[PDB]
Amino acid sequence: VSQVRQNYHSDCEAAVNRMLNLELYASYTYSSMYAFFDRDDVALHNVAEFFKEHSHEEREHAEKFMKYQNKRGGRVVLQDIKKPERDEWGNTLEAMQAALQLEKTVNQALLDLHKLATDKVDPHLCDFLESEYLEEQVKDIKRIGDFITNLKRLGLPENGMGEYLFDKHSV
């Protein structure tokens, strides 16, 4: 074992490695959504940049976990990043709803990892999660929630003008 390792449980380490991968998956899913709205037959470019920013963020989150792992004397073990669930994302409402579920999935995983850290009595990993991840996630969930509400206000599945305006005003 690492000469640095202290109070770092094996399960925690494994869960962090798992979380890292989920982060890269989420990043990759947003990369899909970016490419979808950049398409000429979809063309909502501000929506597209919103998702591109988000893929970069989740990628930076995954790297923070890599750094974390090594700080604690754990070892990074990477797995395959699975392709996102869809190839086309429908429209802005459909994509935002997909995004809300993706963020709640990631949020749940983080809460779970927090509970594991609490059970294994690792104060440091608990703080890492609280400080770098948990508030960031409710911020993002609240923002996407707000977007879905406003997309629906604009009567989105059907109203094209509403979707166009959302691109020019909410992002």
Q: Which long-range contacts (CB under 8 A, 24 or more apart) does 26-29 make?
A: 26/58, 26/102, 26/103, 26/105, 26/106, 27/55, 27/56, 27/57, 27/58, 27/59, 27/61, 27/62, 28/55, 28/81, 28/82, 28/83, 28/84, 29/55, 29/84, 29/85, 29/98, 29/102
From candidates 15, 40, 116, 120, binder to its own copies by CB under 8 A: 40
Least distance (Å) between residue 157 CB and Mg ion: 25
Q: Return the closest-CA partner of residue 72 out of 128, 19, 114.
A: 128
- Contact present, 15 and 22 (Cβ < 8 Å): no
> Which residues ranging from 48 to 87 are in contact with Mg ion (CB under 5 A)?
58, 61
From Mg ion, its own copies, none, interface partner of 13 (C-beta below 5 to 8 A by class): none
> Which residues ranging from 139 to 158 are in contact with its own copies (CB under 8 A)?
139, 141-142, 145-146, 148-150, 152-155
From candidates 11, 49, 94, 100, binder to its own copies by CB under 8 A: 100
Question: Is 18 near its own copies (CB under 8 A)?
Answer: no
169 is in an annotated binding site: no
Q: Is 33 exposed, middle or buried (0-12, 13-18, 19+ CB in 10 A)?
A: buried
Report the residue number, 11 or 132, with the smaller CB distance to its own copies: 132
Question: Is 120 near its own copies (CB under 8 A)?
Answer: no
> Which residues ranging from 115 to 144 are in contact with Mg ion (CB under 5 A)?
140
Q: Return the closest-CA partner of residue 107 out of 85, 75, 130.
A: 130
135 is in an annotated binding site: no
Least distance (Å) between residue 5 CB and its own copies: 9
Question: Is 169 near its own copies (CB under 8 A)?
Answer: yes
From Mg ion, its own copies, none, interface partner of 140 (C-beta below 5 to 8 A by class): Mg ion
Numbered residues of the known binding site: 23, 58, 61, 103, 137, 140
